[PDB]
Design a protein around this ligand. Structure first.
Ligand SMILES: CC1(C)CC(=O)c2ccc(O)cc2O1
Length: 282
């Protein structure tokens, strides 16, 4: 079926939970043996969210190459994304090592450091120009260059230096600050505006490594971001935009990381975002 009318048909019939459970039943199951080794327990935020072995990002280290991060490679859309968990106190240095080694230009952050009164990720970037951060385990230095605070999101310019080689690179930090503590946003308008700002920066384009996107577990809000982007890109590329099947795209992405889209409300919100976004593109 088309998307907008399939949408109203699920709303009128109140069957979002049943649609979402079908997705969960059909989703791929692949081994995640490296993630479950005992030496990696403090590298994982949640025991039930692990990268598949076949698609995990490897750190360029011989001691321990493990990080909770996955490469989602979308072949028809010609887009790649790295989805990861919010960094932990003992993985902030691994996170920036990955950004460096994969040649990423942008980092997309969809959560706040504290939500619901609990810490959802580490404070992994510097908050003042004159107070830079050094990560001694991976030999990197990170400096805040500039910051632009808007009503729904903040963009930061950062400098990452590889202290071994003295090479430097500019990283863009795109921080969506207004996702509600419970539920999903009422309108997709500010999320779409944010996605378009990431696009305009060059961070999603083939001349750079894959963008790094995260929330707390790296599957819920993060899945919404890449699902919406890929679906809109396919509607631009194909002769028949109504052929784009958002459930089939989600199942393709779930071949690369488990659990993408965590609730039936997130699924409905993804439909809403693609529907509204397709009208603005034209
Ligand atoms: C963060 C800053 C002040 C400087 C910068 O490089 C930049 C890049 C992208 C953007 O959307 C806004 C920006 O303003």
């Amino acid at each position: 079926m088309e998307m907008e009318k399939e949408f109203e048909q699920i709303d009128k019939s109140g069957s979002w939970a049943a649609i979402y459970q079908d997705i969960r039943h059909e989703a791929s199951d692949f081994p995640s043996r490296v993630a479950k080794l005992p030496k990696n327990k403090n590298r994982n935020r949640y025991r039930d969210v692990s990268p598949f072995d076949h698609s995990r990002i490897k750190l360029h280290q011989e001691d321990n190459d493990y990080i909770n991060a996955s490469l989602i490679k979308m072949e028809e859309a010609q887009r790649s994304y790295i989805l990861t968990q919010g960094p932990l106190p003992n993985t902030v240095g691994h996170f920036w090592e990955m950004v460096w080694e994969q040649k990423s230009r942008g980092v997309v952050m969809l959560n706040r450091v504290m939500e619901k009164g609990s810490l959802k990720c580490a404070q992994y970037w510097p908050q003042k120009e004159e107070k830079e951060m050094i990560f001694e385990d991976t030999n990197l230095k990170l400096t805040l260059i500039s910051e632009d605070i808007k009503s729904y999101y903040t963009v930061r310019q950062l400098e990452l230096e590889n202290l071994t080689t003295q090479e430097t690179r500019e990283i863009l930090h795109f921080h969506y600050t207004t996702w509600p503590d419970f539920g999903v946003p009422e309108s997709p308008a500010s999320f779409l505006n944010f996605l378009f700002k990431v696009r305009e920066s060059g961070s999603l384009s083939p001349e750079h490594g894959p963008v790094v996107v995260h929330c707390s577990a790296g599957i819920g809000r993060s899945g919404t971001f890449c699902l919406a982007d890929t679906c809109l890109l396919l509607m631009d590329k194909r002769k028949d935009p109504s052929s784009v099947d958002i459930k089939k795209v989600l199942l393709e992405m779930r071949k690369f990381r488990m659990g993408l889209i965590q609730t039936a409300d997130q699924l409905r919100f993804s439909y809403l975002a693609v529907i509204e976004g397709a009208k603005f593109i034209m």
